[PDB]
Amino acid sequence: QGIVEPAGTAVEYGDHTNIPLTSWNANFERRTIVRGELGMMVGTLEEGRASAI
Amino acid sequence: QGIVEPAGTAVEYGDHTNIPLTSWNANFERRTIVRGELGMMVGTLEEGRASAI
Secondary structure, eight states: OOOOOOOOOOOOOOOSOOOOOOOOOEEOOOOOOOOOOOOOOOOHHHHHHHHHH | OOOOOOEOOOOOTTTTTTTOOEOOOOOEEOOOOOOOOOOOOOOOHHHHHHOOO
């Protein structure tokens, strides 16, 4: 994601006075993706024994 | 600018008595050109103030 951030300020008027100017400054932000995992395993005898209950 | 300076004179007339001739001789003169400059500067705020009076 990005940002804009404008800038600038004014002065009093004059015929031969210099000219003030404005600008801006953009920035960016980042986030990180995290992954997880989980598994399982069943045996033949334990599966049959657990079915008794 | 130039000048011509013509020349010639009469000899009195007669048949078979030659023909006088005329001529000229030119000269020239030169001069130099001089140029000058002048300007003005008017501001927007200055212009309006003068228009009041």
